[PDB]
């Protein structure tokens, strides 16, 4: 059995045949010389993290203050215009004119628009008027609707006025409390249509305040049958009217009150918790007798907890019963004598039981009474409780006219991830002489204006930062308004099983890897205090395959106007960047000559990053034609750059020649090398090149350099990086592509570190194998692995066929045992935005758990004994010097015919984490400081059952 000395000696001759080849074929030292040879075509500039955040935060504040002025202008006019309405009841003669959307009329006349297609808008829109959306379950032409369609016609002038001042304005919509929504600009509405403006997340937050809701469900015997099905559906539809700022819990009672789920107290009612409550509600049975005294005492006790995090706001109890005889007068006097809790009572089902006590409990406690006799009445009755909650808000006056911003959600008109402003509109008719005050305690509606996140991304440029640097903003709840990992997909819960209304609320600790320091940083941004911190963490790569440890510098400041906090993740070696300063014409024209598509025969195949170089230039998302447009534009235009930035073009043009000089001076000397298949260079400017043009068809990497997985991993590692190919016929990558190597160039201009590009070569697997023979033995096993346990080449003629595959899926016995020796650490994370094929009860959103592996200890000489049971298999492991590779040699599997369960490193569809215990120690959060409830002037003299 070979000793450790001879194995290290054989390894020393192994990496020296790879490092030297990569150091010479790629020309990493030649590119360093080229950058340092000139030192005058560009200039190094400081990248102060503190300056950037205070500047980017101000720009976001100004953008969100331009939108607030548009809401105040709209809300003020609607209150003024509505007060001058007459409420006529005959529209046959003087019909109202409007454009009803979702169409191809007793008292209305339609409008046929022109609908020119527009940029920054996925649909055909018209700015001449405003469209109107009337839900299917509401009949247009009723007296209420037509009256609302007349006085709202004065908003179209204000719609045009706002768009004149700020042409980059998205949908402006007025959500009427009567159901109809009028939005601008007019665009046709997008199966049946179930849209209702009053149930939208942006409407609900402006119609009321956060609430400490609690639901009482009658599960006594008399509710068995149809009326239990209605009760379960009504509870489910009522949970859909709660947001992340509202706290809910569901309890039942049948001769004994108990919780229906695992929570036992109020929870945040986010997307994950509502899914648990809905499952618990949908699994209840009716049995026993009714006791209202016992049920209400339980409800009042959970609203007095105060050990747990709540909203400290509207406290409401909703009773889902059918009928009864007990009034529970003693319970109400004992618990709420001062009417601090509102009680909303529902009479669900078709029955003839006594509704007297149910109606009495409602208005004796500042509540309201609702009837749900059929399925069609569920949706309209579970959303009408926001009129009662909005009574104290209208009595506040101007103190309640504050602009709020929702969570990130997918737009209902196919626009992407957006956020919406919000401002309620009051009914102030007859308020001049102050005598009516009868129906003047209900809001007219809610105004909203959309701010796309792509608009936010334009205010935080990232091209002067390294590919490892980025911006991110955090909501007071903790969710990320802006983040690289945030994707335009709904966040999933559980596992889909079959026999986009919810917001995309991604927590900060879920977007990236969780850490003890990052928890403290997250808390410091929530409570709005600026600061900075540098520290060392381990960073997941672009793909879920590798983890590398690096240094980062988190700088955060709060946005003054809003409640958001903006942070900048600027790594080391990124505080300085190259600023191109070229002014001479012929020295700029020659650089552009290399980008001609017909010049690839001597400069190599060339890609260019589809950045927003100039406004009239348009991206094509394929780069087959984008390169044609780019180089036929710069010549077909004056070099003064009249309407587009020279900074983003001077970088790409200067880097065009810096890589160009490498090809002829060093790469062209070696036309072909024995062990090298392709040579590539990727540059911060946004260009990549491949010298062998016939091998340029195998470049599947994204043209945008900032999104390249290998680029970001190479900057962090001081040594060379080996990237394993994909498996299971994931395109051509097995033998015709090769093994990728990378090494980021490092330059020192004036003692400052810069990493402007990465260079590498594709190692030929066929020639690499010949370095082991210089084979297929049944006595000993030899494999090579990278940082992450992926096979790169072997000597068994079956291992090499399964190339680029995780070691745990081909030899779990040694792989599982290796982790115990602490050679390979690992971290498990959940991906809340991922689609997977549903299991037995298309694709649906689901949570997938990802794991990655990395080197744990810095020591290289590893040895041990693998005891699979009733036998043994000695092994020795050596890590290649100055390379992320590890060489491990073990006795062949023929001696020990054992095979444990394979250790899979892939996206495992999991339902975790369990939320029954996250509520016990919830993440820190800060609630809204506004609270509009319990106004003494509130009327609440209408029970709701007196008129029903």
């Amino acid at each position: 059995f070979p000793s450790a000395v001879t194995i290290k000696s054989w390894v020393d001759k192994m990496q020296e045949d790879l490092v030297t080849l990569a150091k010479t074929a790629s020309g990493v030292n030649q590119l360093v010389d080229i950058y340092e040879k000139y030192q005058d075509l560009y200039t190094v500039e400081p990248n102060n993290a503190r300056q950037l955040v205070e500047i980017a935060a101000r720009d976001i504040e100004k953008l969100l203050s331009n939108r607030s002025k548009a809401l105040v202008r709209l809300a003020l006019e609607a209150e003024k215009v509505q007060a001058a309405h007459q409420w006529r009841e005959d529209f046959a003669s003087n019909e109202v004119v409007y454009y009803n959307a979702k169409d191809d009329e007793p008292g209305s006349q339609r409008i046929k628009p022109v609908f020119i297609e527009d940029a920054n808008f996925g649909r055909q829109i018209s700015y001449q008027h405003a469209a109107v959306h009337i839900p299917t379950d509401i009949y247009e032409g009723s007296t209420i609707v037509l009256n609302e369609l007349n006085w709202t016609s004065a908003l179209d002038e204000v719609f045009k006025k706002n768009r004149e001042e700020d042409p980059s304005l998205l949908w402006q919509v007025f959500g009427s409390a009567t159901g109809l929504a009028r939005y601008y600009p007019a665009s046709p509405w997008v199966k049946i249509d179930l849209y209702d403006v009053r149930r939208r997340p942006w409407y609900i937050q402006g119609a009321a305040s956060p609430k400490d809701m609690l639901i009482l469900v009658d599960v006594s015997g008399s509710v068995s049958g149809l009326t239990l099905k209605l009760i379960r559906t009504s509870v489910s539809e009522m949970l859909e009217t709660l947001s992340d700022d509202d706290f809910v819990n569901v309890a039942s009672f049948n001769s004994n009150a108990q919780d229906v789920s695992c929570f036992q107290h109020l929870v945040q009612a986010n997307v994950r918790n509502k899914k648990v409550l809905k499952d618990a509600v949908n699994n209840i049975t009716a049995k026993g007798i009714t006791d209202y005294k016992k049920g209400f005492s339980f409800a009042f006790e959970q609203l007095l907890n105060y050990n747990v995090s709540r909203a400290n706001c509207n406290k409401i109890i909703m009773l889902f019963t059918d009928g009864g005889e007990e009034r529970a007068q003693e319970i109400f006097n004992k618990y709420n004598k001062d009417k601090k809790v509102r009680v909303f009572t529902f009479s669900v089902g078709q029955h003839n039981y006594d509704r007297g006590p149910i109606q009495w409990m409602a208005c004796e406690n500042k509540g309201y009474y609702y009837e749900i006799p059929s399925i069609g009445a569920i949706r309209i009755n579970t959303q009408e409780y926001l009129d009662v909650l909005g009574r104290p808000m209208v009595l506040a006056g101007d103190k309640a006219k504050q602009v709020q911003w929702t969570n990130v959600y997918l737009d209902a008109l196919e626009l992407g991830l957006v956020i919406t402003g919000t401002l309620p509109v009051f009914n102030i008719t007859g308020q001049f002489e102050n005598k009516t005050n009868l129906k003047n305690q209900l809001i007219l509606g809610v105004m909203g204006v959309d701010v796309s996140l792509e608009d936010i991304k334009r205010l935080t440029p990232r091209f002067t930062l390294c590919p490892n640097g980025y911006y991110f903003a955090i909501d007071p709840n903790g969710y990320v308004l802006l983040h690289p990992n945030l994707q335009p997909k709904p966040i999933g819960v559980g596992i889909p099983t079959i026999n986009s209304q919810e917001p995309v609320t991604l927590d900060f600790l879920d977007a990236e890897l969780e850490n003890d320091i990052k928890v403290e940083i997250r808390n410091k941004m929530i409570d709005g205090e600026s600061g900075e911190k540098t520290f060392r963490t381990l960073v997941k790569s672009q793909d879920e395959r590798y983890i590398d440890k690096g240094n980062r510098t988190y700088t955060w400041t709060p946005v003054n106007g809003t409640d958001y906090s903006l942070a900048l993740v600027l790594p080391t070696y990124s505080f300085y960047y190259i600023k191109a300063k070229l002014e001479e014409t012929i020295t700029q024209a020659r650089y552009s000559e290399t980008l001609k598509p017909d010049n690839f025969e001597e400069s190599g195949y060339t890609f260019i990053a589809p950045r927003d170089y100039c406004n009239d230039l348009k991206i094509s998302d394929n780069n087959t034609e984008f390169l044609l447009n780019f180089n036929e534009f710069i010549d077909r235009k004056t070099p003064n750059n009249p309407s587009c930035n020279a900074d983003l073009i001077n970088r790409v043009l200067l880097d065009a020649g810096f890589t160009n000089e490498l090809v002829q001076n060093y790469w062209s000397k070696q036309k072909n090398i024995k062990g090298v298949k392709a040579r590539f260079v990727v540059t911060d400017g946004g260009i990549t090149r491949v010298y062998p043009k016939e091998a340029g068809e195998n470049w599947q990497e994204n043209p945008e350099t900032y999104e390249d997985s290998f680029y970001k991993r190479s900057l962090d590692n001081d040594n060379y990086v080996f990237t394993a190919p994909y498996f299971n016929k994931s395109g051509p990558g097995a033998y015709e592509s090769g093994i990728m190597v990378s090494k980021a160039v490092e330059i020192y201009i004036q003692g400052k570190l810069l990493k402007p590009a990465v260079v590498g070569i594709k190692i030929d697997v066929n020639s690499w194998i010949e370095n082991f023979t210089k084979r297929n033995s049944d006595v000993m096993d030899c494999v090579i692995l990278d940082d992450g346990g992926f096979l790169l080449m072997a000597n068994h003629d079956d291992y090499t066929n399964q190339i680029g595959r995780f070691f745990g899926e081909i030899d779990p016995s040694l792989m599982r045992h290796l982790v115990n020796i602490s050679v390979y650490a690992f971290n498990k994370s959940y991906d809340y935005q991922s689609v997977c094929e549903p299991g037995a009860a298309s694709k649906q959103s689901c949570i997938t758990e990802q794991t990655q592996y990395f080197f744990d200890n810095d020591s290289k000489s590893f040895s041990g004994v693998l005891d699979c049971g009733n036998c043994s298999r000695i092994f020795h492991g050596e890590k290649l010097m100055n390379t992320n590779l590890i060489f491990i040699m073990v006795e062949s599997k023929g001696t020990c015919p054992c095979d444990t369960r394979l250790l899979i490193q892939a996206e495992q569809t999991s339902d975790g984490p369990n939320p029954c215990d996250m509520v016990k120690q919830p993440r820190y959060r800060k609630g809204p400081d506004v609270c509009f409830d319990n106004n003494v002037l509130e009327d609440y003299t209408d029970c709701g059952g007196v008129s029903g």
């Binding site: 015997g221 049958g225 149809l226 239990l228 078709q350």
Partner: protein, 48 residues
């Protein structure tokens, strides 16, 4: 209180209280759709 097994509709010819039971017995006595009431009573105790 045993005809609550459909969960999709409410039956009118039941035995929930005395007037309704009396009406149901009268209807069976006249022989009009007594088979429907018999089927409901059979399903109320399991099934076929």
């Amino acid at each position: 209180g045993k005809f609550n097994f459909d969960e999709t509709q409410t039956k009118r010819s039941t035995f929930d209280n005395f007037p309704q039971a009396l009406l149901t017995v009268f209807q069976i006595l006249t022989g009009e759709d007594w088979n429907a009431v018999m089927y409901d009573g059979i399903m109320a105790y399991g099934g076929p």
